[PDB]
Enzyme design. Structure first.
Site, mmCIF file in Angstrom:
data_model
loop_
_atom_site.group_PDB
_atom_site.id
_atom_site.type_symbol
_atom_site.label_atom_id
_atom_site.label_comp_id
_atom_site.label_asym_id
_atom_site.label_seq_id
_atom_site.Cartn_x
_atom_site.Cartn_y
_atom_site.Cartn_z
ATOM 1 N N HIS A 14 0.857 -1.170 0.000
ATOM 2 C CA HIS A 14 0.000 0.000 0.000
ATOM 3 C C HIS A 14 0.894 1.221 0.000
ATOM 4 O O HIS A 14 1.814 1.319 0.808
ATOM 5 C CB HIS A 14 -0.931 -0.016 1.217
ATOM 6 C CG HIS A 14 -2.013 1.016 1.167
ATOM 7 N ND1 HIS A 14 -1.830 2.300 1.633
ATOM 8 C CD2 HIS A 14 -3.290 0.959 0.721
ATOM 9 C CE1 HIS A 14 -2.948 2.989 1.478
ATOM 10 N NE2 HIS A 14 -3.849 2.195 0.927
ATOM 11 N N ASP A 16 0.819 4.263 1.147
ATOM 12 C CA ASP A 16 1.084 4.879 2.436
ATOM 13 C C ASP A 16 2.019 4.035 3.280
ATOM 14 O O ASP A 16 2.927 4.564 3.920
ATOM 15 C CB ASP A 16 -0.215 5.116 3.196
ATOM 16 C CG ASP A 16 -1.066 6.207 2.578
ATOM 17 O OD1 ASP A 16 -0.535 7.008 1.785
ATOM 18 O OD2 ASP A 16 -2.271 6.267 2.890
ATOM 19 N N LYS A 17 1.806 2.723 3.270
ATOM 20 C CA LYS A 17 2.649 1.829 4.057
ATOM 21 C C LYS A 17 4.070 1.690 3.520
ATOM 22 O O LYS A 17 4.998 1.350 4.263
ATOM 23 C CB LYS A 17 2.003 0.449 4.225
ATOM 24 C CG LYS A 17 1.583 0.172 5.661
ATOM 25 C CD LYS A 17 0.615 1.223 6.153
ATOM 26 C CE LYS A 17 0.395 1.082 7.636
ATOM 27 N NZ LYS A 17 1.645 1.352 8.392
ATOM 28 N N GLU A 42 10.185 11.749 6.396
ATOM 29 C CA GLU A 42 8.953 11.211 5.834
ATOM 30 C C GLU A 42 9.155 10.953 4.347
ATOM 31 O O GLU A 42 10.067 11.506 3.732
ATOM 32 C CB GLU A 42 7.758 12.144 6.092
ATOM 33 C CG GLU A 42 7.805 13.497 5.405
ATOM 34 C CD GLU A 42 6.508 14.281 5.583
ATOM 35 O OE1 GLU A 42 5.610 14.157 4.725
ATOM 36 O OE2 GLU A 42 6.393 15.035 6.573
ATOM 37 N N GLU A 55 14.667 15.992 8.159
ATOM 38 C CA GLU A 55 15.752 16.642 8.882
ATOM 39 C C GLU A 55 16.280 15.618 9.868
ATOM 40 O O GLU A 55 15.584 15.247 10.813
ATOM 41 C CB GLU A 55 15.216 17.848 9.658
ATOM 42 C CG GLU A 55 15.823 19.194 9.276
ATOM 43 C CD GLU A 55 17.196 19.425 9.891
ATOM 44 O OE1 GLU A 55 17.316 19.391 11.140
ATOM 45 O OE2 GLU A 55 18.153 19.656 9.120
ATOM 46 N N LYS A 154 -5.577 -4.741 0.749
ATOM 47 C CA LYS A 154 -6.400 -4.045 1.738
ATOM 48 C C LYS A 154 -7.328 -5.066 2.371
ATOM 49 O O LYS A 154 -7.896 -5.915 1.682
ATOM 50 C CB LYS A 154 -7.221 -2.926 1.091
ATOM 51 C CG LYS A 154 -8.112 -2.170 2.075
ATOM 52 C CD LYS A 154 -9.007 -1.175 1.355
ATOM 53 C CE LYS A 154 -9.989 -0.514 2.312
ATOM 54 N NZ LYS A 154 -11.002 0.335 1.618
ATOM 55 N N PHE A 223 -7.299 -6.083 -10.037
ATOM 56 C CA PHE A 223 -6.326 -5.219 -9.344
ATOM 57 C C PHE A 223 -4.960 -5.772 -9.772
ATOM 58 O O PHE A 223 -4.239 -6.386 -8.985
ATOM 59 C CB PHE A 223 -6.578 -5.377 -7.841
ATOM 60 C CG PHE A 223 -5.691 -4.519 -6.945
ATOM 61 C CD1 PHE A 223 -4.572 -3.864 -7.468
ATOM 62 C CD2 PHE A 223 -6.007 -4.401 -5.588
ATOM 63 C CE1 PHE A 223 -3.770 -3.079 -6.628
ATOM 64 C CE2 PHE A 223 -5.208 -3.617 -4.750
ATOM 65 C CZ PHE A 223 -4.089 -2.955 -5.270
ATOM 66 N N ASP A 231 -2.813 7.435 -6.693
ATOM 67 C CA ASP A 231 -2.581 8.840 -6.891
ATOM 68 C C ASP A 231 -1.409 9.453 -6.144
ATOM 69 O O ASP A 231 -0.801 10.428 -6.597
ATOM 70 C CB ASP A 231 -3.916 9.563 -6.612
ATOM 71 C CG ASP A 231 -4.956 9.187 -7.658
ATOM 72 O OD1 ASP A 231 -4.840 8.130 -8.321
ATOM 73 O OD2 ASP A 231 -5.926 9.943 -7.843
ATOM 74 N N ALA A 232 -0.990 8.883 -5.025
ATOM 75 C CA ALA A 232 0.173 9.230 -4.244
ATOM 76 C C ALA A 232 0.222 8.440 -2.933
ATOM 77 O O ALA A 232 -0.818 8.110 -2.363
ATOM 78 C CB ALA A 232 0.196 10.724 -3.925
ATOM 79 N N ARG A 237 -0.162 8.594 7.216
ATOM 80 C CA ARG A 237 -1.549 8.745 6.810
ATOM 81 C C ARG A 237 -2.386 7.519 7.139
ATOM 82 O O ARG A 237 -3.574 7.487 6.838
ATOM 83 C CB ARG A 237 -1.642 9.062 5.324
ATOM 84 C CG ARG A 237 -2.689 10.107 4.989
ATOM 85 C CD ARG A 237 -3.583 9.637 3.863
ATOM 86 N NE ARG A 237 -2.810 9.222 2.692
ATOM 87 C CZ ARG A 237 -2.543 9.997 1.643
ATOM 88 N NH1 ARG A 237 -2.981 11.249 1.600
ATOM 89 N NH2 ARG A 237 -1.867 9.505 0.616
ATOM 90 N N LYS A 238 -1.761 6.503 7.733
ATOM 91 C CA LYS A 238 -2.471 5.284 8.114
ATOM 92 C C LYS A 238 -2.392 5.115 9.634
ATOM 93 O O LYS A 238 -2.067 4.040 10.150
ATOM 94 C CB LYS A 238 -1.883 4.081 7.387
ATOM 95 C CG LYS A 238 -2.877 3.387 6.476
ATOM 96 C CD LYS A 238 -3.432 4.331 5.426
ATOM 97 C CE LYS A 238 -4.468 3.625 4.558
ATOM 98 N NZ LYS A 238 -5.012 4.521 3.488
ATOM 99 N N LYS A 258 9.716 9.040 12.935
ATOM 100 C CA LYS A 258 10.111 9.745 14.146
ATOM 101 C C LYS A 258 10.914 8.836 15.060
ATOM 102 O O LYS A 258 10.544 7.683 15.276
ATOM 103 C CB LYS A 258 8.863 10.245 14.876
ATOM 104 C CG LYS A 258 7.965 11.136 14.029
ATOM 105 C CD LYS A 258 6.656 11.462 14.724
ATOM 106 C CE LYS A 258 5.761 12.287 13.819
ATOM 107 N NZ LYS A 258 4.403 12.482 14.394
ATOM 108 N N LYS A 262 10.624 11.347 20.386
ATOM 109 C CA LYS A 262 9.304 11.930 20.209
ATOM 110 C C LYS A 262 8.290 11.161 21.041
ATOM 111 O O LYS A 262 8.050 9.978 20.804
ATOM 112 C CB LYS A 262 8.883 11.904 18.739
ATOM 113 C CG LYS A 262 9.396 13.065 17.897
ATOM 114 C CD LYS A 262 10.888 12.959 17.640
ATOM 115 C CE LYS A 262 11.387 14.090 16.752
ATOM 116 N NZ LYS A 262 12.845 13.963 16.460
ATOM 117 N N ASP A 264 5.300 11.054 20.897
ATOM 118 C CA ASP A 264 4.229 10.497 20.081
ATOM 119 C C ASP A 264 4.409 9.009 19.854
ATOM 120 O O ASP A 264 3.438 8.265 19.771
ATOM 121 C CB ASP A 264 4.153 11.203 18.730
ATOM 122 C CG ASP A 264 3.400 12.511 18.794
ATOM 123 O OD1 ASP A 264 2.561 12.660 19.711
ATOM 124 O OD2 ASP A 264 3.637 13.376 17.921
#
Ligand SMILES: N[C@@H](C[C@H]1CO1)C(=O)O
Ligand SMILES: N[C@@H](C[C@H]1CO1)C(=O)O
Ligand SMILES: [K+]
Ligand SMILES: [K+]
Ligand SMILES: [K+]
Ligand SMILES: [K+]
Ligand SMILES: [Mg+2]
Ligand SMILES: [Mg+2]
Ligand SMILES: [Mg+2]
Ligand SMILES: [Mg+2]
Ligand SMILES: [Mg+2]
Ligand SMILES: [Mg+2]
Lengths: 368, 368, 368, 368
Positions: A14, A16-17, A42, A55, A154, A223, A231-232, A237-238, A258, A262, A264
């Site tokens: 995927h 994003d992955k 990223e 960075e 998916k 598929f 598209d990108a 984003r996941k 990260k 961090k 997070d």
């Protein structure tokens, strides 16, 4: 007290992955030569075009071309038609790299932790199955059993539940939806058959499969050359598939890319840790631990334990148990959880929580 | 039953939010000339470089350069040093555009809805303040009152709570953290003063401000040329700040860039609608409505109402109230909520839920 | 035998020249640590966006971000409004870097060499003035004399000639056209005045300036925020201004970005060398030496000397002079001309031929 | 007066030529709907990534995705492994498009024109063969005769000459070097055989082929997935192969991407026209016409005819012939040569001069 729930997951292919993995791959590549490397990067991808941004203050020699292409190869993108080829894709590196216990938490924050006894992993059945479904497909892909299987996939699993004078017991898998990329020389009938017998039935416990369970295998038909395009592709984003599949709570912080400094990432891991430890120690059947931090301050700024009446001890009996067994200060977390180790790439897919191979997934003793 | 909570928000200048806005701006631009335009686009930005990606089947003539640059101008990026200039930035358009009631929900899905009476907006105080804090700064920026103020900003609000034989009652603002971009000719002392008197104290109810309330204004010092870079801005990466600030539940679906036919947006709006309607109708003080859909089926596949013991009616009395007052089918949602209207750009920042100017924020009567 | 001629040149700020310089800067950066580094790279730029492409087999540690940004800084792009800022521009590196006397010329080739005695540099007056005009502007820019002057500039010089029982004698400068980027706070009248008195009249010999000489200073009016944009900047696209200003002959081979092993660069330098040596040795007033190579073969595959009846010796008297004074084999060229030295960046602007500081511009003795 | 010469050419698949074609394709697409469209665009490509840049003031509706992808398809890039697939490649359009006889030449300029009677085309044998060699390969590719042949190719032809009390007479082809992209299922031995018999011997006149003629077919071995990367293709970087193969003179102006109002294109065409007309009219066997323009002025600022003693008339008898037969003013050129017609794409490859199908290649009568 019936209700139903649905969760999803995506394969290593995927878009994003791929970015989540590449970003963490760069993190691993630095930790191996400088465990104190400050990583903040990223990735963005789009049809044979990978953009590495970021960075990172470190003191290690890394071949970004190598770490990005190796990650794409690992995922399974070696041929042209698959929508990505590590040997031919454009790897634009716009990365900026410098050189030079009671620390103190960066950025006001609020991390969440969740755990439930409905599965041995202490994670929601819906998300666990969703992840395992994708994991199995990768196995069959890499083993050779299902050679038509391609990296992008998916998964969605919806299970019917019922409460229990405390909380959440799964009854059965209502419906399963799975879509996976594939090679041309394989019929839609053969794919759907393999998905039901070789992947679904090989991972989903008999107890949950029914005669009414609904299957939606390759719903949108083919598929093939799909691959990582959509598209990108982007990093972070996941966010929900990386956590609890929409079961706990989420402040919005992304993990991948990260480093361990961090909150997070680290604190989120720590919060899962204590949650898993609590249920494992029989102190509850379902918990939502909430840990807050104050910018500058090291010691957590108020931790809240949220059982759903599944504990006999009583919130603010369990809090002392946590305060006597855990030291959730940022620095201590990284030390206790061994967060300077390069395990982040394998964390970048199939979920951050659940798999026992991660430090935070090993329940602490809990002396009570 | 004390506990604390934190939420965050970002200004129109935040890299991710710029993409969310630009993507929705393209959606608006199409709806105005073709209310049936199928939009599925996303944006990526990085220091004077905007990439418009996407697949949109519509029949309207749009100047993407114009819609992207106008959006950047609206945000306030007109000068060089600000990190973005709509007149000089690179707008790479890789957009693909074609030409040609009981519908049926696309993609298995599970949408969440949330509402609480702690504020007139029926949204968590923490996130409401976080949003309003950023909103005020934009006002002072556009009015002229604080001419040093620049588009990019980040806000965090942490409020101390206490339960109440039902749920969630805010007591006071524990600490506030706000960072905003700025011009060179303005001292750090003057900024921090203006942030406390002119923005914070002008939006936060006296009842919540304390003598102990902690303020962290421009914590990291100067944020001058910190324009939209933040190592690449992206669309759909600010999922939690677009919703409830981590209070409800989130399946992971992004809004911005997707038209009204995607259940991820529409149904989420519909779920908020009923949640807000329920509390407004006095049927509860806090609700978590859960609406599930089945791919192909129009009528929702099981809706669950989750009050936290704040209702007198009793779940499965309230469900019938919802089933007698609402028709959550995809097509009906768009018709009732007027989802073909170009209001999506203003929805792309400062939160999708809370503001009364949106259809889904207008409470339905509820005949009981 | 009257006729007129025109030639042009561009400043260090010209988009194409920025790429030529950056590409050669990367070449220099490698030679300094590995004189045998195989460099084959090119650059593309477009408003604060630099793309470094290429295949370079070397064994040296280089910080491409540093070498690209330093080159942009050197050129004079430090502020925002100038159309480029080395501190903020996007440097996307898609570079691929590996690690591991009678050689033999790669690729069938035909290199040209040219020289004329109309100037001490042994280069056409038209191109020499064109280059010097741009050079002076950079001096005044870097000195402070003309602080409104910006990096991007373009120059054109057209001189009226007359043959002479041999060839080419310049009579006067017919017209001069010069355009240069600039700051806002400087009138068009003040610019045009400074260009005539401080740049043109300070470089063009009195003998050539007339009362009829036509001046076109900043013809298109303003050129403020222009900078290196021009829709895109590329490497190897300024082939004629890098050579003789359209006076000799050109096969089309680009210099910048290619190391000393490419005959396109080395042999071209060698050909200029012998040409300059011939006229300097009084053996002719104007020559067009043509050296051909055969793929695989080291020794040149036929060299042709083309005097325009300006020599007393006679072609195939001069050829033996060249064959007795020069060894134009690729390997020997690099050794004799010291082509492993990092001087390529300064060669990337203001012309490759003419300046005496380059090895190939130092006339060989010529024993006859 | 023996000497040798070499020239080269590239196929439609060469990265630079793809950009030249795409840029001209966009020019054609505009002329068809607005013959007064002001076009100034350029293209950049790199492995399935095409960037369209430019400023074009026109009033026509164009689908840039369609014009770019159609051009890539025409070239022969439809499959993955070829290094480009019009259906999958990234087409990033950063194009800016507005809407709204004795003209006057823009920009000081100096255009060159060349012609020689050594071939019926009135072009150097070396470059003509080089072009025809590539042309034949495209034919065999598109016909099916040689189905292993792929779009990208490079050609070099070196012919041995001898002067003749005037100039240039070709004697024989010394050596030929040809490299062409190809499919996997074809042996290096079979390729080299087909190149010699089916392409070389089918285009090169028997008179020139020898028993000593050197052939270098696929010198570097295999050129399979060598699709358009060549470390970034660009527009206007193949300036010499678009003209005379290094035989005339070149000021450095690029053609492709520029409309008929730019003297760099129009005037260059006009200069070729008169050159071809002169030799065709028997007024000379070899000419180098030089036309100069002055910014603002319409009528050419001095035209010079350069015969190499091949004319009986005498320069400044031939000049009057040109002044009585030609009106080289910019506006008149476009009218007489029909330069508002969309023929620019076919001009973007295999050379601008030589092919009779172009207006400027049709010799004017010449009344003397
Ligand atoms: N690529 C999409 C589905 C494909 C079939 O259209 C996915 O992420 O499942
Ligand atoms: N930037 C152009 C000229 C500017 C004024 O329009 C140049 O290269 O001279
Ligand atoms: K999205
Ligand atoms: K997110
Ligand atoms: K051009
Ligand atoms: K060139
Ligand atoms: Mg998903
Ligand atoms: Mg579907
Ligand atoms: Mg996909
Ligand atoms: Mg120029
Ligand atoms: Mg002008
Ligand atoms: Mg310019």
């Amino acid at each position: 007290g019936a209700f139903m729930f649905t969760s999803e997951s995506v394969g290593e292919g995927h878009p994003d992955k791929i970015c989540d993995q590449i970003s963490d791959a760069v993190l691993d590549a630095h930790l191996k030569q400088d465990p104190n490397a400050k990583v903040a990067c990223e990735t963005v991808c789009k049809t044979g075009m990978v953009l590495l941004c970021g960075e990172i203050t470190s003191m290690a020699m890394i071949d970004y071309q190598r770490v990005v292409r190796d990650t794409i190869k690992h995922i399974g993108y070696d041929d042209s038609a698959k929508g990505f080829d590590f040997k031919t894709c454009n790897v634009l590196v716009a990365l900026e790299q410098q050189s030079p216990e009671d620390v103190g938490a960066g950025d006001q924050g609020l991390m969440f932790g969740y755990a439930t006894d409905e599965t041995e992993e202490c994670m929601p059945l819906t998300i666990v199955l969703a992840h395992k479904l994708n994991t199995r497909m990768a196995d069959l892909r890499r083993s050779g059993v299902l050679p038509w299987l391609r990296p992008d996939s998916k998964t969605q699993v919806t299970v019917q539940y019922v409460q229990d004078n405390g909380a959440v017991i799964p009854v059965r898998v209502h419906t399963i939806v799975i879509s996976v990329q594939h090679n041309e020389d394989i019929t839609l009938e053969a794919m759907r058959e393999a998905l039901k017998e070789q992947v679904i039935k090989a991972v989903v416990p008999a107890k949950y499969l029914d005669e009414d369970t609904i299957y939606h295998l390759q719903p949108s038909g083919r598929f093939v050359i799909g691959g990582p395009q959509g598209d990108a592709g982007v990093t972070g984003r996941k966010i929900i598939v990386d956590t609890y599949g929409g079961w706990g709570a989420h402040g919005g912080g992304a993990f991948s890319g990260k480093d361990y400094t961090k909150v997070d990432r680290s604190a989120a891991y720590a919060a899962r840790w204590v949650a898993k430890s609590l249920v494992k120690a029989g102190l509850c059947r379902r918990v939502l631990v909430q840990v807050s931090y104050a910018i500058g301050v090291a010691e957590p700024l108020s931790i809240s334990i949220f059982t759903y009446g599944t504990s006999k001890k009583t919130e603010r009996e369990l809090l002392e148990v946590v305060n006597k067994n855990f030291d959730l200060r940022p620095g201590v977390i990284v030390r206790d959880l061994d967060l300077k180790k390069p395990i982040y790439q394998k964390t970048a897919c199939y979920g951050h929580f659940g798999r026992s191979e991660f430090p935070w997934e090993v329940p602490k003793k809990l002396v009570f």
